[PDB]
């Protein structure tokens, strides 16, 4: 079981003002360290954000979070779930700002809600370098879904604060599980008028403007006022990271049909789902750490049957131990592995 620690920093808040936080379950003998952020959406206004805190307010609030949680999946410290990283030190940091970890707002006189997640992150680092992260080899920052994006959205500033503070040697990594989307053509279209007809495009630069959303500085760079909303997309922010990034996405994410209004298959929908995944592929030829397997599903790194899937015959366990081999080609020991069959369950590893 990992353990519930509340910031000590009370100015660093979810949604309704409640303290933000983080579970822990420490590996004394152990060097590397790895911080997993959460997922589940995120609300965009007023209204949007009233409705997900009658009925999902685990994720804006942690009045009712439980004192300790579970370590599954690459949060497990059985070697028989979690053949890669199980003698690690985890933690799991509960997703609670509703802002996809990029927001930097207080509540206030002004503001409803509270939206922060990109300074939860640099406040769990900050309180953990004074229980043991200090002494770190390598900080895994990894999540699933929206915490995918958010590692992409925040790895870099993890690499840059333990720089400022001092810390040159610990090397700051990160692995992102399905939050690589495309901003590509819709299978039907509706004009953003509501929650539901709002394509991630139109839905996300709003959010910027609610949240005070902060996206990394040389992506922002690029595309400049008005248009950080292009750095929420991974095949334009990635090339713009300095950290090794492994990259974990399956090629018909269910999260990615839902947003292209997507739900027997007739000739237009079965062109449209197989230039879905060629583009996908596309966008990750030249990646060099991935893991991409020709599936519907949704999520992979905490399940605890993540061991099952395999591509080309390697397991993402296996791939992710031949990453870290490759950061000290590898006979028998690849990093970059994605599918070539064009249609879901393809390839006979997928979930049922
Ligand atoms: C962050 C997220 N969670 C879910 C869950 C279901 C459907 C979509 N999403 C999204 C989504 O639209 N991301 C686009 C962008 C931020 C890369
Ligand atoms: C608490 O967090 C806020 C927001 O990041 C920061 O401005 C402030 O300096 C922090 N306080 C302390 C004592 O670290």
């Known amino acids: 079981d990992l353990r519930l620690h509340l910031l000590l920093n009370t100015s660093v808040t979810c949604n309704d003002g409640s303290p933000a936080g983080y579970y822990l379950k420490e590996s004394r003998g152990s060097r590397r360290w790895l911080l997993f952020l959460e997922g589940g959406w995120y609300c965009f206004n007023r209204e949007n954000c009233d409705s997900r805190y009658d009925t999902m307010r685990r994720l804006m609030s942690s009045r009712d979070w439980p004192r300790t949680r579970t370590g599954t999946g690459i949060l497990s410290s ?48 900050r309180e953990l370098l004074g229980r043991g992260l200090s002494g770190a080899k390598v900080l895994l920052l990894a999540g699933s879904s929206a915490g995918g994006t958010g590692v992409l ?22 692995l992102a599980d399905s939050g690589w989307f495309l901003d590509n ?17 139109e839905a996300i630069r709003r959010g910027i403007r609610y949240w005070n959303g902060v996206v990394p500085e040389r992506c922002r760079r690029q595309f400049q006022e008005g248009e950080e909303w292009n750095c929420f997309f991974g095949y334009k922010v ?17 999260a990615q049909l839902t947003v292209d209004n997507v739900h027997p298959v007739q000739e237009g929908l079965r062109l449209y789902i197989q230039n879905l995944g ?17 599936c519907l599903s949704h999520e992979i790194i905490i399940r605890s049957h993540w061991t ?41 590893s997928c979930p049922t």
Not at 157 to 162: G, I, K, N, P, S
Not at 238 to 254: G, N
Not at 278 to 294: M, Q, Y
């Open 78 to 125: 059985q070697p028989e779930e979690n053949p890669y990283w199980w003698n690690a030190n985890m933690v799991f940091i509960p997703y609670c700002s509703s802002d996809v970890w990029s927001g930097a707002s207080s509540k206030s006189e002004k503001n409803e809600y509270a939206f922060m997640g990109a300074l939860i992150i640099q406040e769990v680092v």
């Open 308 to 348: 099952d899937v395999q591509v080309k015959g390697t397991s993402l366990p296996r791939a992710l131990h031949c990453w870290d081999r490759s950061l000290h080609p590898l006979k028998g020991c690849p990093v970059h592995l994605v599918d070539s069959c064009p249609w879901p369950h393809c390839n006979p």
């Open 278 to 294: 060629r583009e996908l592929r596309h966008t990750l030829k030249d990646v060099p750490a991935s893991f991409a397997p020709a």
């Open 153 to 174: 959205l925040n790895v870099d500033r993890v690499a840059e604060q333990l720089e400022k503070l001092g810390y040159p040697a610990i090397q700051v990594r990160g």
């Open 238 to 254: 990635y090339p713009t990271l300095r950290s090794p990034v492994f990259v974990v996405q399956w090629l018909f994410d269910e």
């Open 185 to 201: 053509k819709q299978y039907r279209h509706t004009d953003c008028v509501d929650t539901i007809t709002c394509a991630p495009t």
